[PDB]
């Protein structure tokens, strides 16, 4: 039950800047690789069903907990405004390939970010009838099998991104669940097309819904979840170097 | 030409909401039930595909039906459910590793695309056309414009078949939405050519579609049902047809007065 | 010229008796290799090779401006004159995805791709056009089409003296040598986009919920001074398997009202 | 360039104070043996690297088209002057399909590097002379090169970057750029494209205006009685030949304006 | 940071005595294989092959951030200062079409295409940047440039401890390993777009009639706290005939006014 927002004063508002690292899976271990660049992609036979954990990208996950607050009404932190910019280099010389000429980053892309008062809700799906995912580090939809390539009430697994072990290659954001959350995604096909990426210093995102309510930190935490798959360069998967976030909080009665 | 009166002021008792997923439909080569697949069987070669592609190498319009709670009915003024607002988002994965092809490198999804959705108080009205002078369609599962022949590749008053999407057997490769018929319906489509271009697909959590026409009237469920019809052909990957994994819908209803 | 010396007065307030609506489809036109009647085809015959195509392509390997004519009901008419005025229209193109019909014998999926031309025009008279040549040797079909110069070439540039000025009165005008005249089309609204030819795909949107207003700076639509409205259009989508494709057919919903004019 | 002039009230527009002209402007290809311009939409075949990279034949390059308009004459203390406040401009263009079929087989079209540009002014367009590379000279024939038998820098130089005004049809779009530091009493507009064989996309209509008033509601002032149109529409390459727009249309809308003597 | 601990008051109402304007050009910078002075080139030396380029490309095969500095006239005449404030600017890039200079020896028209990077920044201090590596082995030129690590590699990811934080004080910063810091650039407005590398063409617009406003949420532009304004930019257009091209040069028109500040 959402009541009036506390009029914002120096005592009622909170700001944080932070960077979020991209996540590549781990071929022999359980800690995430904070890499912008993956290990070489395996060949069809392997990649099509069981790609090495370090040839896939996972949702990065970051958690923010603003200062503690000092009845029948309760005061809660509300995210109402944010800036987010991705760190990115041009690959030119690092793009020169042994054949000769300039390959670059190109191919399939996935840009996504999410802010919420809880973990991001996702759905487990398969691209094809035989894709399993890494047999190693990642939480697959089915740990040694395949889930359908279509929505199933009974068989489509419903998970929450609580760790950095969720491959963007088999987990989609759930459009039927993500309350108290704003999320945003674009994906691209794969006839070797270039990523186009803009970045500025002068660009805000408002977060208020139809009723002027932002994201409510009901449990004291805010959940950031994101991924910026840029494509492939020299048979290696590239992501954004890292993503910046400036979060603007105020207090709200509940 | 029915008689639309005032919308009932929306209260907790007069409004209705549903969330649902719609599955993509691939045709059935050895059967009559639809395949709920995001990925098809391998495409046949020119000689076959150009005239009679296997039913499981084509995409069909998905069809879903919603019937909101009964309205306990003045033998003069009726109450009708009215769809005035909706959200729709498509579920989609990036194909990277599943995109690696045997020759080496990263193929992806690319090629011809077709995005389409429709909401209505009746089935979607369509027109039967042929891409070329010899395209028949699957000789198997689908309702073809002409069951063992070809219809013209042009609009004909006499020869262009006019059907309504009442089942999941209508191939997007020979059925187009009828711009001269779809009253009490809002529909929307984009198609792409085929020099192996990538699909670009956005999805969000914060995006609405208003459905009111010039007179502020949404879609009226005159028979108590709302008809959803859609297709999201994403292109081809490794000689196989891909669609969106599934499409989400949140429907917003209110009640509206109509005269007999 | 077309609107010259016409004196436009108040629009008649629109009532059930003063307004008129029509829906219609317009068929694409491919030229005719051994005839004079138009081929209503969305798909052409196979393209000839350079030597032929570059100068004299077979009439059935080119697209012509489709032409359709609408005449609203008679008006029971002093110094004033009621006249039909087109003020609003919807137009949508019928289009299929070519996937299986796109599979080519070499293997894989060719599609429609290459040079494109989208165009439509509404007017109270035929569309005014200018005859030009893409190159120094393009003549056009020696068969069915009205060429800028029957067995020669016209310049590849605007010439006051040598650039032919015609009006699209029939379905014999090839989009490959006739351009809309920007210096003539009064009492007419027209619209065109063309694409180059490094095999790029057509992108085509269609809806149910999209209008075009037709009123000019003075709030005057298209006036049917002779009782007829002239529709002129072409939707060249590109090439698939060495064959020219167009839109299947184009839909039109025309909205008319009455308007006062001096004699 | 504009300073010194003192702009007063615009004369309220009546049938006696306003002027309109429609006109076409022809594209210009250079002349391999001659000093008159070729009014061509299509050039002669492009030379090979060794030649083209440094000294391309004059008829393998595009030059800025130039057209001049002088409205009717006008008759004490302060002057009446013609002011361009509104214009329409549309390019004439064909689809190349059959003329696009190439001897190898299939449909080549127009594709490659593009340059769209137009300018309206009360004086010639001010340009800057630059070189794409360290060895590009330009045609040794018809064109005014930045340096008639040498190269100018591939970068702005206060001392070495030549500053000219487009007074004739001899200026190659391949070595002359509009000067962003000079063009007062002028509105100009340009887009260029790179060269991995990409197609031109070109729109044309009947129902599209360009307003020309600046921040102070002042259009282009014809201080010397003439208006200067300058333009170029490089569409790309088809069958090893350079194509431009067929011709560009212009409808110019003039009114009168007061200026202190 | 750069702003925090400053107290901004009313802008001085702009009169002929309180406002200042400058026009200037900024030259592109290619690195120097043998020297320490920058090469003001729009075109680089031929790109090295993978083995070299991937880790240690020759300084003259990379682009560096151009840097330009503007210092407006001194302000004459306690408890508060007058300061110069940039509130408006125009910026346009000088660019040629490469057609004939694009013809390549194998035949046909190559052009400029491939990876692109457009960027500009205005500030009251140097632009803050972060040192990152594209890959696990990229070092940069062993010659002219300030590398993130002068003989080694820095991470390909943000590290609080290991990601170097520098300020662009000279023309020795390679756009191939230095990114603008989104967590630092107060009293600065910056803007960038990058493109991937499947040989895609640059598309570049330029006009005469296009402004950029610079006021923030509170209507405050860029404040020249030390009397200088810092311009920093780069326009990597792509590659033509195995050579790196940039914009020829970038124009700037800067609009200043005066503003009150507490000491
Ligand atoms: Cl189910
Ligand atoms: Cl018929
Ligand atoms: Cl003449
Ligand atoms: Cl200098
Ligand atoms: Cl850290
Ligand atoms: Na941005
Ligand atoms: Na969306
Ligand atoms: Na539309
Ligand atoms: Na236009
Ligand atoms: Na601009």
E27 interface with D at CB cutoff 8 Å: yes
- Rounded to the nearest 5°, which phi and psi values hold at D100? -95, -20
Tokens 């063009």 -> residue: D183
Contact E242/A at CB under 8 A: yes
Residue D129 near chain C (CB below 8 Å):
no
* Interchain pair C110, B194: CB under 8 A: yes
Contact E248/D156, CB-based, under 8 Å?
yes
**Number of independent structural domains in chain C:** 1
Q: Does E touch A (3+ CB pairs < 8 Å)?
A: yes
Give the separation between CA E50 and CA C214, rounded to whole angstroms: 59
Report the alpha-carbon distance of residue E99 to residue D53 in Å, rounded: 9
A199/E189 CB distance under 8 A: no
Residue corresponding to tokens 């072409």: C234
Distance from CA of D113 to the nearest CA of E (A): 6
- Among residues B85, B111, B93, B40, which one has the least CA distance to residue B201? B93
Q: Is any Cβ of chain E less than 8 angstroms from the Cβ of A95?
A: yes
DSSP code at position C184: T
Q: Which residue(s) pair with B155 in the sheet?
A: none
Task: Report d(CA C155, CA C159) in Å as an integer.
Answer: 7
State the smallest CA–CA distance between residue A7 and chain B in angstroms.
26
Cβ-contact A92, E176 below 8 angstroms: yes
In a 13 Å sphere around the CA of E179, the CA atoms on its Cβ side amount to: 31
First to last CA, chain D: 16
Contact flag B172-C111 (C-beta cutoff 8 Å) = no
What is the rounded distance in angstroms from the CA atom of residue B119 to the CA atom of residue B136?
28
DSSP letters, E52-107, are: HHTT---GGGSEE-EEEEE-PPPPP---EEEEEEEEEEEEEEE----SGGGB-TTS
Determine the distance from the C-alpha atom of residue D69 to the mean position of all C-alpha atoms in its chain, rounded to a whole number: 15
Nearest CA in chain A to B104: A43
**Dist. CA E48–CA B241, nearest whole Å:** 41
Alpha-carbon distance A65 to nearest alpha carbon in chain B (angstroms):
24
> Can you spell out the DSSP letters for A59-110?
-EEEEE-PPPP---S-EEEEEEEEEEEEE----SGGGB-TTSSB--SBS-EE
| Residues of B with Cβ-Cβ distance to A154 under 8 angstroms | none
The DSSP letter of residue E49 is P
Q: Does E177 touch chain A (CB under 8 A)?
A: yes
Residue E248: which residues within 8 A CB-CB, separation 6 or more?
D130, D154, D155, D156, D177, E28, E42, E93, E94, E95, E96
- B68 lies in which domain range? 1-260
CB of D204 within 8 Å of any CB in chain C?
yes
The answer to whether the CB atoms of E240 and D49 lie below 8 A apart is no
DSSP helix/strand/coil, A212: coil
Distances (CA, A) of B199 to A168, A236, B17: 17, 22, 31
H-helix or E-strand spanning residue D52: helix D49-52
Six token digits for residue E96:
């040629």
Distance between CA E19 and CA E112 in Å, rounded? Answer: 41
Residue E127's SS3 state is coil
Q: What is d(CA C71, CA B119) in angstroms, rounded to the nearest whole number?
A: 34
Whole-number Cα distances in Å, E21 to A239, D81, E226: 42, 29, 18
Residue E197, φ and ψ in degrees, nearest 5: -130, 30
**Alpha-carbon span A127 to C25, nearest angstrom:** 41
Contact assessment for residue D46 and residue D56, using Cβ atoms and an 8 Å cutoff: yes
With contacts defined as CB-CB under 8 Å, which chain E residues touch D180? 90, 92, 94, 206, 208, 251
Nearest residue to D113 (alpha-carbon basis) of D195, D202, D201:
D195
d(CA D81, CA D256): 5
Question: What six digits make up the tokens of B111?
Answer: 């090629």
Residues B253, B15: contact at Cβ < 8 Å?
yes
Compute how many other C-beta atoms are within 10 angstroms of the C-beta atom of residue D16.
7
Instruction: With H, G, I as helix, E, B as strand and everything else as coil, classify residue C155.
Output: coil
Bridge partners for D150 per DSSP: none
Residue A139: count of CB within 10 angstroms of its CB: 19
From residue D259, give the alpha-carbon distance in Å to each of D2, D14, D72, D77, E48.
12, 19, 18, 10, 61
Rounded CA separation A95/C145 (Å)? 52
Beta-carbon neighbours within 5 Å of ion ligand 5: E 160
User: Please, which chains are in contact with D (at least 3 CB pairs closer than 8 A)?
Assistant: C, E
Round to whole Å and give the CA distance between A171 and A169. 6
Query: Which secondary structure element, helix H or strand E, spans residue D243, and what is its range?
Result: strand D242-244
Asked if E62 lies within 8 A of A93 by C-beta distance, the reply is: yes
Cβ partners under 8 Å of residue B222, min gap 6 = B2, B80, B121, B122, B184
How many contacts (CB atoms, under 8 Å) link B and C? 160
User: Is the Cβ of B99 closer than 8 Å to some Cβ of chain A?
Assistant: yes
Q: Position of tokens 């000839």?
A: C48
Distance (Å, whole) CA E239 – CA E230:
29
Q: Are C249 and B128 in contact (CB under 8 A)?
A: no
Cα(B173)–Cα(B114) distance, integer angstroms: 10
D chain contacts of residue E113, beta-carbon cutoff 8 Å: 194-196
**Which ligand sits nearest to residue B22's alpha carbon?**
1
Mutation for testing the A interface, residue in B96, B105, B232, B252 having most A CBs under 10 Å: B96
C122 by DSSP, 3-state: which? strand
Taking residue C213's Cβ as centre, other Cβ atoms within 10 Å add up to 12
Identify all chain B residues contacting C234, using CB atoms and an 8 Å cutoff: none
**Chain A hits for E51, Cβ within 8 Å:** 98
Q: Let me know: does E260 contact E223? Beta carbons within 8 Å.
A: no
CA separation for the pair D260, D250 (Å, rounded): 30
- Min Cα separation B116/chain A (Å): 18
Task: Determine the distance separating the centroid of ligand 3 and the alpha carbon of C177, expressed in angstroms.
Answer: 20
C180 touches chain D (CB under 8 A): yes
CATH number, domain at D183?
2.60.175.10
- Distance, in Å, from the CA atom of B30 to the CA atom of B42, rounded to the nearest integer, reads 15
Residue A187, CB-side half-sphere exposure with 13 Å CA sphere: 23
Bridge partners of D62, per DSSP, are D29
Cα C65 to Cα C173: distance, rounded to the nearest angstrom? 6
| Contact state of E101 with D189 under an 8 Å Cβ cutoff | no
Tell me the structure's resolution in angstroms, rounded to a single decimal: 2.9
Beta strands in chain A (DSSP E): 14-20, 23-24, 57-58, 60-64, 75-87, 109-116, 121-124, 158-160, 171-173, 181-188, 196-200, 205-206, 215-216, 222-232, 237-239, 242-253
DSSP string, B68-120: PPP-----SEEEEEEEEEEEEEEE----SGGGB-TTSSB--SBS-EEEEEEEE
H/E segment holding residue D250: strand D247-260
Question: Would the CB atoms of E179 and A241 count as touching at under 8 Å?
Answer: yes
CB A234 within 8 A of CB A125: no
Give the integer Cα–Cα distance in Å for A218 and A226. 21
CB-based contact A37 E134, cutoff 8 Å: yes
Is A145 an 8 Å CB contact of chain B?
no
Q: Considering only CB atoms, which chain A residues are within 8 Å of E216?
A: 202
8 Å CB contact between D252 and D2:
no
d(CA E263, CA A103): 54
Is the separation of the CB atoms in E43 and D134 below 8 Å?
A: yes
CB-CB neighbors (< 8 A) of E204 in chain D: 191-193
Answer yes or no: are the C-beta atoms of B36 and B24 closer than 8 Å. Answer: yes
Round to whole Å and give the CA distance between A141 and A163. 15
Q: What are the residues facing A14 on neighbouring strands?
A: A249
Closest CB from E176, E185, E195 relative to A93 = E176
The closest ligand to the CA of C161 turns out to be 3
Min distance E43 CA to chain D CA atoms (Å): 6
The pair of structure tokens assigned to E173 is 């910063």
Residue C127 in contact with partner chain D when CB distance is under 8 A: no
Token pair of A106, please? 């190109």
What's D98's DSSP letter?
Answer: G
CA atoms of D84 and D219, how far apart (whole Å): 5
Does D101 contact C47 at a Cβ distance shorter than 8 Å? yes
Which residues have CB atoms below 5 A from the ion given as ligand 3? Answer: C 160
């Amino acid at each position: 039950d959402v009541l009036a927002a506390v009029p914002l004063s120096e005592e009622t508002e909170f700001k944080v800047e932070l960077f979020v690292k991209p996540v590549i899976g781990n071929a022999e271990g359980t800690t995430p690789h904070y890499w912008s660049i993956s290990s070489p992609l395996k060949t069809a036979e392997a990649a099509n069903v069981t790609p090495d954990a370090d040839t896939t990208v996972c949702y990065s996950l970051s958690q923010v907990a603003p200062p503690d607050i000092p009845e029948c009404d309760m005061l809660i932190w509300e995210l109402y405004r944010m800036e987010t910019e991705v760190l990115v280099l041009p690959v030119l010389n690092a793009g020169i390939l042994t054949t000769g000429g300039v390959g670059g980053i190109a191919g399939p892309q996935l840009y996504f970010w999410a802010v919420g008062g809880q973990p991001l809700d996702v759905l487990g799906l398969a691209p094809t009838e035989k894709y399993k995912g890494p047999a190693q580090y990642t939480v697959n939809p089915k740990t040694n099998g395949t889930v359908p390539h279509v929505y199933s009430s009974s068989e489509t697994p419903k998970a929450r991104v609580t760790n950095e072990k969720y491959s963007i290659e088999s987990w989609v954001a759930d459009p039927s669940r993500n309350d108290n959350c704003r999320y945003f995604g674009r994906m691209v096909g794969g006839a070797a097309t270039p990523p186009v990426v803009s970045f500025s210093n002068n660009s805000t995102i408002p977060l208020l819904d139809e009723n002027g309510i932002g994201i409510l930190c009901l449990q004291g935490r805010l959940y950031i979840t994101c991924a910026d798959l840029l494509g492939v360069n020299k048979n290696r998967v590239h992501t954004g170097l890292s993503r910046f976030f400036r979060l603007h909080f105020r207090q709200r009665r509940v």
